[PDB]
């Protein structure tokens, strides 16, 4: 369907074993079973994994993860949110 370049580096930094764990949390917010969660529910995904950045970097993260602008986050865009702050500029 689609293939953003940001997803090429995201899965490149995440090991197959890591991406597997991130999937466990995906189904958590994916109560619909469609494979898409609300960017507003992401704030909850943070405290779940382990992150407490400034509310600012949060909003920017949403507009930086939706490279398509569909209005929803997908497992593919998830791996990006992880490498988003894990590899912002370091
Ligand atoms: Ca999207």
Segments forming the whole domain that contains residue 64: 1-90
Identify residues whose C-beta is under 5 A from ligand 1, the ion.
Answer: 66, 68, 70
Cα-based distances in Å from 37 to 12, 13, 24, 64, 78: 23, 23, 14, 16, 10
CATH code assigned at 74: 1.10.238.10
Q: Report the domain count for the chain.
A: 1
Which tokens sit at 71?
């209005």
Rounded Cα gap, residues 13 and 19, in angstroms: 10
Q: How far is the CA of 89 from the centre of ligand 1 (A)?
A: 23
Rg (C-alpha) for the chain, rounded Å, is: 12
Q: How far is the CA of 54 from the centre of ligand 1 (A)?
A: 22
Strands 73-74 and 36-37: antiparallel
DSSP assignment string, 8-63: HHHHHHS-HHHHHHHHHHHHHH-TTSSSEE-HHHHHHHHHHHS----HHHHHHHHH
Q: How far is the CA of 72 from the centre of ligand 1 (A)?
A: 5
End-to-end, the C-alpha distance of the chain in Å comes to: 31
Q: How far is the CA of 29 from the centre of ligand 1 (A)?
A: 15
Q: How far is the CA of 10 from the centre of ligand 1 (A)?
A: 15
């Amino acid at each position: 369907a689609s293939m953003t370049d940001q997803q090429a580096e995201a899965r490149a930094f995440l090991s197959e074993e890591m991406i597997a764990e991130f999937k466990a949390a995906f189904d958590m917010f994916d109560a619909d079973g469609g494979g898409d969660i609300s960017t507003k529910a992401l704030g909850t995904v943070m405290r779940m994994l382990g992150q407490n950045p400034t509310k600012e970097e949060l909003d920017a993260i949403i507009e930086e993860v939706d490279e398509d602008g569909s209005g929803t986050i997908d497992f593919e865009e998830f791996l990006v949110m992880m490498v988003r702050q894990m590899k912002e500029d370091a």
